[PDB]
């Protein structure tokens, strides 16, 4: 049974359907897991996410570069960043960002709308827990959303190293059709529901090993519908069991190889190594980031 897993990933037969989009109606909606003593929800949530990422083919190069969007919290701190830095090998470059100010253990933190964020270099792993509170004001058909999803799609296409991976928080109403389409540009993809939040429509949309071109054409409107269909017909038991075994939590430093390479040079052997988590492609220069700042003189 599923309850001893960190969470549940979308079974493949659901990925293959052509469902229409219904309202999400989960039988355990509102129930809260019992969390171990003194542990915040988002430490449990991120712990389970990382426990699941440990079962995939992540590239893990020396001097890994990881960027974490939506890392702030109403508490003024960054529980997610703390778990990622725990999980990631020591000395992994971790940058994070949020719209509102917070205190972080990341190596560098940028405050502002994510669309203001720019980076010279590419990344081996992108994490987003962004969620707009206005998504709660459902006033119409659940359409594809833009905003930070539009930024994220472009950021991936422009600044995710080949062989890199992503995990991007969605919900029933906080979702984007191009993001699903772009999952077709990875070797493998899923939607992963943590067991501590099994009662929520939240999932992490995980793209494993980026290939820079489509393996598969995905209709994002259809696929979100498939995902809601899965959630609607497979209730998940809230469970905190996996939180109690942290013996194998750390990400194994694979020392994955990094090559700069031009588009001409990406042949089917290179593409094979990307698919297997055995290669990263990007510059290996220094990591430089910035936030765009709008200037206004309010006087007169």
């Amino acid at each position: 049974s599923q309850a001893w897993q960190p969470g549940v990933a979308m079974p493949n037969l659901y990925k293959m359907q052509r469902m229409l989009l219904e309202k999400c109606d989960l039988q355990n909606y509102g129930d809260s897991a019992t969390l171990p003593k003194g542990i915040m929800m988002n430490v449990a949530k991120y712990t389970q996410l990382c426990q699941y990422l440990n079962t995939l083919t992540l590239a893990v190069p020396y001097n890994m570069r990881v960027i974490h969007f939506g890392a702030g919290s109403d508490k003024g701190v960054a529980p997610g960043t703390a778990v990622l830095r725990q999980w990631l090998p020591t000395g992994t470059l971790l940058v994070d960002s949020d719209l509102n100010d917070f205190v972080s253990d990341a190596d560098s933190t940028l405050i502002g709308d994510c669309a203001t964020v720019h980076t010279a270099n590419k990344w081996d792993l992108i994490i987003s827990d962004m969620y707009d509170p206005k998504t709660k004001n459902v006033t119409k058909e659940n359409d594809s959303k833009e905003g930070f999803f539009t930024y994220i799609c472009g950021f991936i296409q422009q600044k995710l190293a080949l062989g890199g991976s992503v995990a991007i928080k969605i919900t029933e109403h906080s979702w984007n059709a191009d993001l699903y389409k772009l999952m077709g540009h990875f070797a493998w993809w899923t939607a992963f529901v943590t067991n501590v939040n099994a009662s929520s429509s939240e999932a992490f949309l995980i793209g494993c090993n980026y290939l820079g071109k489509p393996r598969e054409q995905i209709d994002g409107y259809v696929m979100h519908a498939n995902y809601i269909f899965w959630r609607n017909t497979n209730p998940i038991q809230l469970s905190s069991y996996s939180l109690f075994d942290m013996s194998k939590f750390p990400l194994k430093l694979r020392g994955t190889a990094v090559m700069s390479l031009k588009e001409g040079q990406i042949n089917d052997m290179i593409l094979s190594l990307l698919s297997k988590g055995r290669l990263i492609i990007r510059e290996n220069n220094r990591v430089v980031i910035s936030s765009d700042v709008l200037v206004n003189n309010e006087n007169l």
């Binding site: 542990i39 915040m40 701190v77 529980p79 703390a82 778990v83 725990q86 205190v103 013996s247």
Partner: protein, 116 residues
């Protein structure tokens, strides 16, 4: 001009007055089979300790004030601090009020056995 805000004193006195300790310190899941050292690059709690994200346990970080250090560097941020389970109600107070032995790396008085 000699003036500087003494936030350490402020919190120590607030606690002494019976003030509610700073909260939302970020506690980590770990095996609790670690070294017990005070401040580490990954959680190192033993069975007598809880591990926390450093930044959230630092009084200067949490209060949005400058670090008492010429270069402003912070001892805790980017790291994990192990807190005696008996003081994990006030991790900020603990790290402020206590000291780390430069020799063994354990909290002077809460693991340091260099006097024996």
């Amino acid at each position: 001009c000699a003036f500087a805000v003494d936030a350490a004193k402020a919190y120590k006195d607030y606690l002494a007055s019976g003030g509610q300790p700073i909260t939302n310190c970020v506690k980590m899941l770990c095996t609790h089979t670690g070294t017990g050292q005070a401040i580490t690059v990954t959680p190192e709690a033993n069975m007598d300790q809880e591990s926390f994200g450093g930044a959230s346990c630092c009084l200067y970080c949490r209060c949005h004030i400058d670090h008492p250090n010429p270069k402003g560097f912070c001892d805790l941020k980017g790291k994990y601090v192990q807190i005696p389970t008996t003081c994990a109600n006030d991790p900020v107070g603990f790290t402020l009020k206590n000291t780390v032995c430069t020799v063994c790396g354990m909290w002077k008085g809460y693991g340091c056995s260099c006097d024996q």
